[PDB]
Amino acid sequence: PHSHPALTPEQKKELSDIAHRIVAPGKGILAADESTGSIAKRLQSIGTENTEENRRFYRQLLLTADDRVNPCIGGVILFHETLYQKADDGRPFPQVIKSKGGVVGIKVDKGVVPLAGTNGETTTQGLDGLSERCAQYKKDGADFAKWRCVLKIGEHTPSALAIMENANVLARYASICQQNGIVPIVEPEILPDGDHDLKRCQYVTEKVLAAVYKALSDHHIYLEGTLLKPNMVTPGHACTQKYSHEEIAMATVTALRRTVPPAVTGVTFLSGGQSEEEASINLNAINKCPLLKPWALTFSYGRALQASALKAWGGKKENLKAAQEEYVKRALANSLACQGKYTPSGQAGAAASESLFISNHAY
Amino acid sequence: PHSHPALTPEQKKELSDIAHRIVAPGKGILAADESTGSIAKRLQSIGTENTEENRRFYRQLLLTADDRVNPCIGGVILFHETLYQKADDGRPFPQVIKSKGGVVGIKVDKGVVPLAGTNGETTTQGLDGLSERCAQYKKDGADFAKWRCVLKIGEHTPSALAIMENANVLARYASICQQNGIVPIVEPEILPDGDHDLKRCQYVTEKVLAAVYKALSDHHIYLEGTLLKPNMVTPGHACTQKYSHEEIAMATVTALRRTVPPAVTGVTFLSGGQSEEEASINLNAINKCPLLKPWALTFSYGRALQASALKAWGGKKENLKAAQEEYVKRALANSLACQGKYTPSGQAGAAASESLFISNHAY
Amino acid sequence: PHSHPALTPEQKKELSDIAHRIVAPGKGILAADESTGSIAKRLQSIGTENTEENRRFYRQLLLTADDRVNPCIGGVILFHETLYQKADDGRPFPQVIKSKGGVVGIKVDKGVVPLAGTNGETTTQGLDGLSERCAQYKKDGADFAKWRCVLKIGEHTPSALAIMENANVLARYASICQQNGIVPIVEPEILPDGDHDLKRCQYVTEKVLAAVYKALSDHHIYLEGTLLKPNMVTPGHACTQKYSHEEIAMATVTALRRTVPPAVTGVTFLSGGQSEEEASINLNAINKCPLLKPWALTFSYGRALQASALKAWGGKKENLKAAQEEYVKRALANSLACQGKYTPSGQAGAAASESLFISNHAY
Amino acid sequence: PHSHPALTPEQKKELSDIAHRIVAPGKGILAADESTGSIAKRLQSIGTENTEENRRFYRQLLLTADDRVNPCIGGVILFHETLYQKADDGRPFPQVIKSKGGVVGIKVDKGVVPLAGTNGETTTQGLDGLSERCAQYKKDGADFAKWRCVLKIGEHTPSALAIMENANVLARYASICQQNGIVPIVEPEILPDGDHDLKRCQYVTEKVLAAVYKALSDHHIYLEGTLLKPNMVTPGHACTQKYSHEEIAMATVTALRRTVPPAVTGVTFLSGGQSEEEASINLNAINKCPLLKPWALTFSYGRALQASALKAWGGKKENLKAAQEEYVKRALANSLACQGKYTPSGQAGAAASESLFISNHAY
Ligand SMILES: O=P(O)(O)OC[C@@H](O)[C@@H](O)[C@H](O)[C@H](O)COP(=O)(O)O
Ligand SMILES: O=P(O)(O)OC[C@@H](O)[C@@H](O)[C@H](O)[C@H](O)COP(=O)(O)O
Ligand SMILES: O=P(O)(O)OC[C@@H](O)[C@@H](O)[C@H](O)[C@H](O)COP(=O)(O)O
Ligand SMILES: O=P(O)(O)OC[C@@H](O)[C@@H](O)[C@H](O)[C@H](O)COP(=O)(O)O
């Protein structure tokens, strides 16, 4: 009979197998995909000129940390330039990543662009020629990709248009990726900017994710062959009201349970500005939340895995080891965190629970 | 938007507790909500006059079955008439149901109506004065409701309009119910009529459910305070190709995992014309399907729980006891099935977890 | 995704012929469809008891005005009760209306109901059994109907949900009407309540009408067989900034030109609280607006045609003539207005300039 | 309350003024924007090598036709390459166009791309860096742009996804253009391929356009600053039923009246494979259609203005004069057609004194 499925069972198996590898138990993602202009600001914060060699050295610094990170890193997201650079031993970075047990990912969006008629809202571009790009990236060692849409909570934002448009472009991106054997990481980041409280973020997150999945369905996206990279549900950066990690965890898990189909292979949280410690603690609380979570809940951190490393390096080659040690430190912390076994202190623990605390209908 | 939550933490807790009671481990729902017109067909099928007394006697037959059904029945759906009838001992049927540990339910839709401009498609009516009806039903013993929408698989159905409209009306229905302390069972039934295959039914079910949940989100429905009543995923009635129960189970569970948020408290399958044994076996296979299932997967059967009871009764007072044994038998069978413990032996349960080496990428 | 003719060519002609008849040059609509509870309030503003006879007498007063109203009134909307009432001469009100060359219309909605999760927003009920009601109304003399949805401008309103839902139910209402030979007047009223300015009302009116027509399209509605009853575009009742009639006319015609397809037979403005004189003057400025207007632009007034009459009557039968004279005054004025030939009289100003605005909140 | 206007009054004025200039009475558009690959097909049909010089000479040939085309061409669409080429006299082609009273247009889409999971349907790419491209084009002489989406009528096409996606990307393209002072020509072309009949094409065209305008509204598009470039409503190429030009005209105008807001400045039909004569005769019948049309109905022809000229040229510079004469004849023909004054094989006549309103409802 008449039938035109988007993928064959062979294409589905390849995508599903890749997605599961990335978020296998205890593993997370290192998001080191900052574009030229963005990494330039990072290097600037430590008085380091933004040359290709310094970008190569910094990326090599993270990608070649010792084997203690192997069990912690299921994947590494790179920016185009880096995907084609090499370590001092002549090995292309994709080979270095793979030799350490990681799956190579490539950021494919081309930045945000303003949505006319909105209060400073944006959508994301990068769809032009994406299919050919994906085909080339695949041949060059990449198995997954990343695309970032940005939404903001404000007076009249996110608006209906911004929500619908961003969800739609994510679906287009995901569709093209899957046609090329690349697992798409869908990143609809809701910024923490503003003074909104926890319930407001949870509400917006629920509305945004519902839109994202309806769009993924309309575009015939194979969910088992994807990963979701959302913001955790937290109060606004300037929210006067304060909250505990357990509340943040409850709000986040609740929002996800109400919008993310169990078919989605994994949820890899962005750190969104949270300190390295805060990001690890919250991820740990999320994994210890009493609710049933049918998908891996791990990390895809940029700042939360590089903050201390960048600083320790200071743009000086003699600080290589010390810098790598800071990164390992966070890779190890978050690996435990995505399993709910993180105790902020040293590395050893004992107990891990929070009995006598129910009633979560306040969410 | 983002103005005034639909439910307080108190209302949420009430709706959630009710929903969970209905689908507690080993429990399912008896769907005896046939309207006067539909019950006439059943009675006529056994040479029995369609009088209010015969309807009462029949419903009494099912509701007063012995204590063996107590742990099997978490809820009972009734038609308006029956909610206000009494057993021979003078006890209102709702009291009879509650005394056996069941939650009382009430059907609130007013039948299907044709959608102009479509190929024989419909939407369902019954929203007028629904809030008032719900407040009254709640007061009179009902804690949940049921609303049925009907869709068909055909050359050009379900159409975009049918999918959209039915999803929207279901959302309106659920919203009104939740404002009145009533748990809404959302029933988007896709008829098994036609010669379409299993893959086609899975496809359509996936599209329908994605639409159903997007609408529930748009209407601010509290998912934890709802239940889903969908068709299992099966080939069309006239489909020549044959499938196994494992294939029906796999297709069904896959469809649900790709569309139903984990927040949904439970899925209560309609039997849709399957024989009593067929409905029990598929339900059992569904619960044995190796994939992760974040919600209760049980029954809300009408024909699958009454077929043999109705036949044995035959409208004859003398067959009351024989008729009840037939109903109890199915009640016990499905109770085991919703736990994946149904074997033709009965209480014994050694044969389980059969096979394992399989591929779900074919779905 | 093919075409399944909702209407035959014969049905289309009937609906189109009716629509054009109602808004023929120089003609408008008398909206006397206030329900028992709404009319009761009008009778209390004149110390008149709300009795069936008083409602009948009042309706007879308007409907039996001298022949001067014949060229002015293309149609009259009635409430259910009045449709089956008779004049002192024994003639059913529909026969009376028809003998004066007017088309009989029937209000069929059942009032607004609250949308949970919104900031005091509503949708409208009345679809249940609407097909049968329309069939009977048709046999009893009615050729068109009216259904009112209510939207409010404020902080966060109209919400995406309120706009979507109200547009969809209007579409359902219109579909059922056309299946029974009744022309549906689609009324998506955006209340004037608030301190918003002209451009804000224009903005919201454009978004609302865009939604209304997309919905009408999705439901396969025959536009030539419909009429639109919108609010004129004006500043909020509490706006400080003042505007001329030319500006109001410009904003109104512009919003309409940007959303209403030329196929729509006519636009019949509701007066929404404006005084009899203001409503006429604005309708006149609208028809004088230089921009191309592909549809008839006339009136369908309730308050703006009854203000002075209800007053002159005072429930005292002796004031029959005086009261009827005030009604004729406004019909003639509006008849000229919808032709762009009205210049104020300056005679009857006892209640023709009074603000007929009414607070809107709660039930 | 800000509404966040996408455009200021001056920006609107500029776009509106440009749109009206292109479709001024008696004027149409020459679509000579064939990309390198497409123009290759045209040149190969006449045994000519596809070199830049040959393309430059051919475009020069059209752009430099004598002054007789001046009153006929309100705008000329160019492909990027041609926008920066010069005539033999050293004048930039844009300068040539403007010196003859024409507005310069630029095609900005980057071709169609397959939509995964559909039956050979596509969407269009080209949004990446479009803002900067539009700013550059504006500075270099262009005042309007063109973007083509392609949909097809088939057993299951256009699908809901195809319609939704194409309408959305058209809205994004239109939004970016208007932000840069460029008038966007929205071209949602429904191919004539297939054996579907006239009513079928009319149905799909109505649905596609309704989707297009809802999307434009959602994206805050200033309609008075746009032009619509749709297919005329005709039977599929393989349709065995025959229709008159009057029938084609009725269906076309009817479809447009039911979906295109009067605010739209103009409708510029694509020829879509029709012969030069057919395209002219149909455009003429459309302009003579008795129904009310609130927008200019003219041409934006590619093949219908070049067929004979391309053939007469044959890649031989010695055929310049002959080639140009064929183009001049077609420009004159369509200029008359967009005024409803075209008569092939007998350019002579004088009538038109009545109007009336009769027609039928078979559309
Ligand atoms: O400025 P660019 O070139 O667009 O790069 C953006 C990129 O860094 C982000 O999308 C991160 O991959 C992701 O959001 C996690 O980052 P954190 O929020 O954990 O730091
Ligand atoms: O004809 P009516 O008055 O509308 O009643 C319909 C009602 O019986 C059904 O909705 C069942 O509750 C449900 O679909 C399970 O039925 P089964 O498919 O298991 O027989
Ligand atoms: O209170 P009910 O029973 O729902 O009746 C409502 C009805 O009067 C209105 O819908 C008018 O037909 C229309 O809005 C024009 O009224 P004006 O705005 O011209 O006064
Ligand atoms: O193949 P490309 O390089 O994408 O170019 C397409 C371009 O020729 C068309 O979009 C015309 O501007 C328009 O559709 C009218 O063409 P006709 O239908 O009148 O021939």
mmCIF file with all atom_site columns, N, CA, C and O and ligand atoms in Angstrom, chain C residues 31-39 77 79 107 109 111 146-148 187 189 229 269-273 300-304, ligand 3:
data_model
loop_
_atom_site.group_PDB
_atom_site.id
_atom_site.type_symbol
_atom_site.label_atom_id
_atom_site.label_alt_id
_atom_site.label_comp_id
_atom_site.label_asym_id
_atom_site.label_entity_id
_atom_site.label_seq_id
_atom_site.pdbx_PDB_ins_code
_atom_site.Cartn_x
_atom_site.Cartn_y
_atom_site.Cartn_z
_atom_site.occupancy
_atom_site.B_iso_or_equiv
_atom_site.pdbx_formal_charge
_atom_site.auth_seq_id
_atom_site.auth_comp_id
_atom_site.auth_asym_id
_atom_site.auth_atom_id
_atom_site.pdbx_PDB_model_num
ATOM   1   N N   . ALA C 1 31  ? -31.228 44.460 16.571 1.00 0.00 ? 31  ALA C N   1
ATOM   2   C CA  . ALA C 1 31  ? -30.869 43.373 17.469 1.00 0.00 ? 31  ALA C CA  1
ATOM   3   C C   . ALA C 1 31  ? -31.710 43.484 18.737 1.00 0.00 ? 31  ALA C C   1
ATOM   4   O O   . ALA C 1 31  ? -31.375 44.232 19.657 1.00 0.00 ? 31  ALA C O   1
ATOM   5   N N   . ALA C 1 32  ? -32.808 42.735 18.769 1.00 0.00 ? 32  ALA C N   1
ATOM   6   C CA  . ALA C 1 32  ? -33.720 42.734 19.906 1.00 0.00 ? 32  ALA C CA  1
ATOM   7   C C   . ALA C 1 32  ? -33.720 41.358 20.556 1.00 0.00 ? 32  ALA C C   1
ATOM   8   O O   . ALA C 1 32  ? -34.726 40.929 21.119 1.00 0.00 ? 32  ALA C O   1
ATOM   9   N N   . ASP C 1 33  ? -32.578 40.678 20.485 1.00 0.00 ? 33  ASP C N   1
ATOM   10  C CA  . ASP C 1 33  ? -32.438 39.327 21.020 1.00 0.00 ? 33  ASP C CA  1
ATOM   11  C C   . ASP C 1 33  ? -31.936 39.223 22.460 1.00 0.00 ? 33  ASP C C   1
ATOM   12  O O   . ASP C 1 33  ? -31.269 38.254 22.807 1.00 0.00 ? 33  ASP C O   1
ATOM   13  N N   . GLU C 1 34  ? -32.246 40.203 23.302 1.00 0.00 ? 34  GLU C N   1
ATOM   14  C CA  . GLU C 1 34  ? -31.807 40.133 24.692 1.00 0.00 ? 34  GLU C CA  1
ATOM   15  C C   . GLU C 1 34  ? -32.535 38.973 25.378 1.00 0.00 ? 34  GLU C C   1
ATOM   16  O O   . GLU C 1 34  ? -33.747 38.823 25.230 1.00 0.00 ? 34  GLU C O   1
ATOM   17  N N   . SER C 1 35  ? -31.800 38.142 26.115 1.00 0.00 ? 35  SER C N   1
ATOM   18  C CA  . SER C 1 35  ? -32.413 37.005 26.799 1.00 0.00 ? 35  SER C CA  1
ATOM   19  C C   . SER C 1 35  ? -33.146 37.452 28.060 1.00 0.00 ? 35  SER C C   1
ATOM   20  O O   . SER C 1 35  ? -32.948 38.564 28.540 1.00 0.00 ? 35  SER C O   1
ATOM   21  N N   . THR C 1 36  ? -33.986 36.566 28.586 1.00 0.00 ? 36  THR C N   1
ATOM   22  C CA  . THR C 1 36  ? -34.787 36.831 29.779 1.00 0.00 ? 36  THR C CA  1
ATOM   23  C C   . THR C 1 36  ? -34.051 37.593 30.878 1.00 0.00 ? 36  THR C C   1
ATOM   24  O O   . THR C 1 36  ? -34.583 38.550 31.438 1.00 0.00 ? 36  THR C O   1
ATOM   25  N N   . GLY C 1 37  ? -32.830 37.165 31.185 1.00 0.00 ? 37  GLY C N   1
ATOM   26  C CA  . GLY C 1 37  ? -32.059 37.821 32.225 1.00 0.00 ? 37  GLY C CA  1
ATOM   27  C C   . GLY C 1 37  ? -31.465 39.158 31.822 1.00 0.00 ? 37  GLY C C   1
ATOM   28  O O   . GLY C 1 37  ? -31.313 40.051 32.657 1.00 0.00 ? 37  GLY C O   1
ATOM   29  N N   . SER C 1 38  ? -31.128 39.302 30.545 1.00 0.00 ? 38  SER C N   1
ATOM   30  C CA  . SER C 1 38  ? -30.539 40.541 30.050 1.00 0.00 ? 38  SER C CA  1
ATOM   31  C C   . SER C 1 38  ? -31.600 41.602 29.766 1.00 0.00 ? 38  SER C C   1
ATOM   32  O O   . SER C 1 38  ? -31.375 42.793 29.979 1.00 0.00 ? 38  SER C O   1
ATOM   33  N N   . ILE C 1 39  ? -32.757 41.169 29.281 1.00 0.00 ? 39  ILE C N   1
ATOM   34  C CA  . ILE C 1 39  ? -33.833 42.103 28.986 1.00 0.00 ? 39  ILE C CA  1
ATOM   35  C C   . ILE C 1 39  ? -34.430 42.573 30.314 1.00 0.00 ? 39  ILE C C   1
ATOM   36  O O   . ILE C 1 39  ? -34.819 43.732 30.459 1.00 0.00 ? 39  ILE C O   1
ATOM   37  N N   . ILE C 1 77  ? -33.090 40.482 14.828 1.00 0.00 ? 77  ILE C N   1
ATOM   38  C CA  . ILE C 1 77  ? -32.653 39.324 15.600 1.00 0.00 ? 77  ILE C CA  1
ATOM   39  C C   . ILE C 1 77  ? -33.544 39.217 16.828 1.00 0.00 ? 77  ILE C C   1
ATOM   40  O O   . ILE C 1 77  ? -33.759 40.202 17.534 1.00 0.00 ? 77  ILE C O   1
ATOM   41  N N   . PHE C 1 79  ? -34.902 36.731 20.380 1.00 0.00 ? 79  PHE C N   1
ATOM   42  C CA  . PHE C 1 79  ? -34.545 35.719 21.364 1.00 0.00 ? 79  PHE C CA  1
ATOM   43  C C   . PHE C 1 79  ? -35.597 34.627 21.173 1.00 0.00 ? 79  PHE C C   1
ATOM   44  O O   . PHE C 1 79  ? -36.680 34.896 20.655 1.00 0.00 ? 79  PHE C O   1
ATOM   45  N N   . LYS C 1 107 ? -31.206 34.368 17.791 1.00 0.00 ? 107 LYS C N   1
ATOM   46  C CA  . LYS C 1 107 ? -29.982 34.224 18.570 1.00 0.00 ? 107 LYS C CA  1
ATOM   47  C C   . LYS C 1 107 ? -29.976 32.772 19.036 1.00 0.00 ? 107 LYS C C   1
ATOM   48  O O   . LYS C 1 107 ? -30.986 32.282 19.547 1.00 0.00 ? 107 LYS C O   1
ATOM   49  N N   . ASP C 1 109 ? -26.886 31.197 20.680 1.00 0.00 ? 109 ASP C N   1
ATOM   50  C CA  . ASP C 1 109 ? -25.883 30.847 21.682 1.00 0.00 ? 109 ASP C CA  1
ATOM   51  C C   . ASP C 1 109 ? -26.553 30.768 23.049 1.00 0.00 ? 109 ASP C C   1
ATOM   52  O O   . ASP C 1 109 ? -27.678 31.257 23.232 1.00 0.00 ? 109 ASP C O   1
ATOM   53  N N   . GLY C 1 111 ? -25.021 31.820 26.039 1.00 0.00 ? 111 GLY C N   1
ATOM   54  C CA  . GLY C 1 111 ? -24.225 32.596 26.971 1.00 0.00 ? 111 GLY C CA  1
ATOM   55  C C   . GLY C 1 111 ? -22.764 32.211 27.072 1.00 0.00 ? 111 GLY C C   1
ATOM   56  O O   . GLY C 1 111 ? -22.332 31.186 26.548 1.00 0.00 ? 111 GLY C O   1
ATOM   57  N N   . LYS C 1 146 ? -27.536 34.397 15.164 1.00 0.00 ? 146 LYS C N   1
ATOM   58  C CA  . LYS C 1 146 ? -26.473 35.186 15.757 1.00 0.00 ? 146 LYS C CA  1
ATOM   59  C C   . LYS C 1 146 ? -25.905 34.442 16.956 1.00 0.00 ? 146 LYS C C   1
ATOM   60  O O   . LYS C 1 146 ? -26.644 33.834 17.731 1.00 0.00 ? 146 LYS C O   1
ATOM   61  N N   . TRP C 1 147 ? -24.586 34.493 17.094 1.00 0.00 ? 147 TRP C N   1
ATOM   62  C CA  . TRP C 1 147 ? -23.879 33.838 18.192 1.00 0.00 ? 147 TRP C CA  1
ATOM   63  C C   . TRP C 1 147 ? -22.821 34.829 18.645 1.00 0.00 ? 147 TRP C C   1
ATOM   64  O O   . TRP C 1 147 ? -22.025 35.306 17.830 1.00 0.00 ? 147 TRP C O   1
ATOM   65  N N   . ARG C 1 148 ? -22.810 35.134 19.940 1.00 0.00 ? 148 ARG C N   1
ATOM   66  C CA  . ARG C 1 148 ? -21.872 36.109 20.481 1.00 0.00 ? 148 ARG C CA  1
ATOM   67  C C   . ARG C 1 148 ? -20.750 35.576 21.352 1.00 0.00 ? 148 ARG C C   1
ATOM   68  O O   . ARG C 1 148 ? -20.992 34.898 22.346 1.00 0.00 ? 148 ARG C O   1
ATOM   69  N N   . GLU C 1 187 ? -20.226 36.881 15.544 1.00 0.00 ? 187 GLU C N   1
ATOM   70  C CA  . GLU C 1 187 ? -19.941 38.016 16.410 1.00 0.00 ? 187 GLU C CA  1
ATOM   71  C C   . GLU C 1 187 ? -18.838 37.799 17.435 1.00 0.00 ? 187 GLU C C   1
ATOM   72  O O   . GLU C 1 187 ? -19.057 37.208 18.489 1.00 0.00 ? 187 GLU C O   1
ATOM   73  N N   . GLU C 1 189 ? -17.065 39.798 19.697 1.00 0.00 ? 189 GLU C N   1
ATOM   74  C CA  . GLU C 1 189 ? -16.978 41.123 20.282 1.00 0.00 ? 189 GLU C CA  1
ATOM   75  C C   . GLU C 1 189 ? -15.816 41.337 21.226 1.00 0.00 ? 189 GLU C C   1
ATOM   76  O O   . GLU C 1 189 ? -15.649 40.616 22.198 1.00 0.00 ? 189 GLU C O   1
ATOM   77  N N   . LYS C 1 229 ? -20.123 40.423 12.578 1.00 0.00 ? 229 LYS C N   1
ATOM   78  C CA  . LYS C 1 229 ? -20.623 41.427 13.515 1.00 0.00 ? 229 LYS C CA  1
ATOM   79  C C   . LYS C 1 229 ? -19.512 41.754 14.509 1.00 0.00 ? 229 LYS C C   1
ATOM   80  O O   . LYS C 1 229 ? -19.445 41.188 15.599 1.00 0.00 ? 229 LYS C O   1
ATOM   81  N N   . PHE C 1 269 ? -21.919 46.155 12.282 1.00 0.00 ? 269 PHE C N   1
ATOM   82  C CA  . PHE C 1 269 ? -21.366 46.579 13.565 1.00 0.00 ? 269 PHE C CA  1
ATOM   83  C C   . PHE C 1 269 ? -22.310 46.573 14.759 1.00 0.00 ? 269 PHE C C   1
ATOM   84  O O   . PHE C 1 269 ? -23.466 46.970 14.658 1.00 0.00 ? 269 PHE C O   1
ATOM   85  N N   . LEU C 1 270 ? -21.787 46.123 15.897 1.00 0.00 ? 270 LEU C N   1
ATOM   86  C CA  . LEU C 1 270 ? -22.521 46.124 17.155 1.00 0.00 ? 270 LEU C CA  1
ATOM   87  C C   . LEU C 1 270 ? -22.221 47.532 17.681 1.00 0.00 ? 270 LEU C C   1
ATOM   88  O O   . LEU C 1 270 ? -21.207 48.110 17.300 1.00 0.00 ? 270 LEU C O   1
ATOM   89  N N   . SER C 1 271 ? -23.086 48.100 18.521 1.00 0.00 ? 271 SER C N   1
ATOM   90  C CA  . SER C 1 271 ? -22.827 49.451 19.031 1.00 0.00 ? 271 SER C CA  1
ATOM   91  C C   . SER C 1 271 ? -21.964 49.453 20.293 1.00 0.00 ? 271 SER C C   1
ATOM   92  O O   . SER C 1 271 ? -21.331 50.456 20.619 1.00 0.00 ? 271 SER C O   1
ATOM   93  N N   . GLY C 1 272 ? -21.950 48.322 20.994 1.00 0.00 ? 272 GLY C N   1
ATOM   94  C CA  . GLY C 1 272 ? -21.138 48.161 22.191 1.00 0.00 ? 272 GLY C CA  1
ATOM   95  C C   . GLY C 1 272 ? -21.109 49.205 23.298 1.00 0.00 ? 272 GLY C C   1
ATOM   96  O O   . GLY C 1 272 ? -20.065 49.407 23.918 1.00 0.00 ? 272 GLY C O   1
ATOM   97  N N   . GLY C 1 273 ? -22.229 49.860 23.576 1.00 0.00 ? 273 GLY C N   1
ATOM   98  C CA  . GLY C 1 273 ? -22.227 50.849 24.642 1.00 0.00 ? 273 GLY C CA  1
ATOM   99  C C   . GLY C 1 273 ? -22.180 52.295 24.184 1.00 0.00 ? 273 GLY C C   1
ATOM   100 O O   . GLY C 1 273 ? -22.430 53.210 24.967 1.00 0.00 ? 273 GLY C O   1
ATOM   101 N N   . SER C 1 300 ? -26.088 46.547 13.275 1.00 0.00 ? 300 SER C N   1
ATOM   102 C CA  . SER C 1 300 ? -26.832 45.461 13.893 1.00 0.00 ? 300 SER C CA  1
ATOM   103 C C   . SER C 1 300 ? -26.818 45.926 15.344 1.00 0.00 ? 300 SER C C   1
ATOM   104 O O   . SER C 1 300 ? -26.121 45.358 16.187 1.00 0.00 ? 300 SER C O   1
ATOM   105 N N   . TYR C 1 301 ? -27.583 46.983 15.613 1.00 0.00 ? 301 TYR C N   1
ATOM   106 C CA  . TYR C 1 301 ? -27.636 47.592 16.935 1.00 0.00 ? 301 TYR C CA  1
ATOM   107 C C   . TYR C 1 301 ? -28.705 47.117 17.912 1.00 0.00 ? 301 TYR C C   1
ATOM   108 O O   . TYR C 1 301 ? -29.855 46.853 17.546 1.00 0.00 ? 301 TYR C O   1
ATOM   109 N N   . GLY C 1 302 ? -28.296 47.028 19.171 1.00 0.00 ? 302 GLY C N   1
ATOM   110 C CA  . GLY C 1 302 ? -29.205 46.647 20.228 1.00 0.00 ? 302 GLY C CA  1
ATOM   111 C C   . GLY C 1 302 ? -29.512 47.931 20.972 1.00 0.00 ? 302 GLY C C   1
ATOM   112 O O   . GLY C 1 302 ? -30.535 48.574 20.731 1.00 0.00 ? 302 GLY C O   1
ATOM   113 N N   . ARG C 1 303 ? -28.592 48.329 21.847 1.00 0.00 ? 303 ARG C N   1
ATOM   114 C CA  . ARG C 1 303 ? -28.746 49.542 22.643 1.00 0.00 ? 303 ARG C CA  1
ATOM   115 C C   . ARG C 1 303 ? -28.886 50.819 21.811 1.00 0.00 ? 303 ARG C C   1
ATOM   116 O O   . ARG C 1 303 ? -29.740 51.661 22.101 1.00 0.00 ? 303 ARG C O   1
ATOM   117 N N   . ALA C 1 304 ? -28.058 50.961 20.778 1.00 0.00 ? 304 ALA C N   1
ATOM   118 C CA  . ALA C 1 304 ? -28.083 52.149 19.925 1.00 0.00 ? 304 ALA C CA  1
ATOM   119 C C   . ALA C 1 304 ? -29.366 52.361 19.123 1.00 0.00 ? 304 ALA C C   1
ATOM   120 O O   . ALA C 1 304 ? -29.515 53.378 18.451 1.00 0.00 ? 304 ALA C O   1
HETATM 121 O O1  . LIG E 2 .   ? -27.328 39.235 27.002 1.00 0.00 ? 3   LIG E O1  1
HETATM 122 P P1  . LIG E 2 .   ? -27.783 38.204 25.852 1.00 0.00 ? 3   LIG E P1  1
HETATM 123 O O2  . LIG E 2 .   ? -29.028 37.481 26.192 1.00 0.00 ? 3   LIG E O2  1
HETATM 124 O O3  . LIG E 2 .   ? -26.545 37.207 25.596 1.00 0.00 ? 3   LIG E O3  1
HETATM 125 O O4  . LIG E 2 .   ? -27.941 39.096 24.523 1.00 0.00 ? 3   LIG E O4  1
HETATM 126 C C1  . LIG E 2 .   ? -26.779 39.618 23.874 1.00 0.00 ? 3   LIG E C1  1
HETATM 127 C C2  . LIG E 2 .   ? -27.177 40.499 22.688 1.00 0.00 ? 3   LIG E C2  1
HETATM 128 O O5  . LIG E 2 .   ? -27.987 41.582 23.152 1.00 0.00 ? 3   LIG E O5  1
HETATM 129 C C3  . LIG E 2 .   ? -25.938 41.050 21.981 1.00 0.00 ? 3   LIG E C3  1
HETATM 130 O O6  . LIG E 2 .   ? -25.139 39.967 21.498 1.00 0.00 ? 3   LIG E O6  1
HETATM 131 C C4  . LIG E 2 .   ? -26.334 41.962 20.816 1.00 0.00 ? 3   LIG E C4  1
HETATM 132 O O7  . LIG E 2 .   ? -27.088 41.203 19.866 1.00 0.00 ? 3   LIG E O7  1
HETATM 133 C C5  . LIG E 2 .   ? -25.104 42.549 20.120 1.00 0.00 ? 3   LIG E C5  1
HETATM 134 O O8  . LIG E 2 .   ? -23.949 42.408 20.952 1.00 0.00 ? 3   LIG E O8  1
HETATM 135 C C6  . LIG E 2 .   ? -25.320 44.027 19.789 1.00 0.00 ? 3   LIG E C6  1
HETATM 136 O O9  . LIG E 2 .   ? -25.673 44.752 20.972 1.00 0.00 ? 3   LIG E O9  1
HETATM 137 P P2  . LIG E 2 .   ? -25.258 46.296 21.157 1.00 0.00 ? 3   LIG E P2  1
HETATM 138 O O10 . LIG E 2 .   ? -23.663 46.301 21.368 1.00 0.00 ? 3   LIG E O10 1
HETATM 139 O O11 . LIG E 2 .   ? -25.534 47.010 19.741 1.00 0.00 ? 3   LIG E O11 1
HETATM 140 O O12 . LIG E 2 .   ? -25.978 46.944 22.278 1.00 0.00 ? 3   LIG E O12 1
#
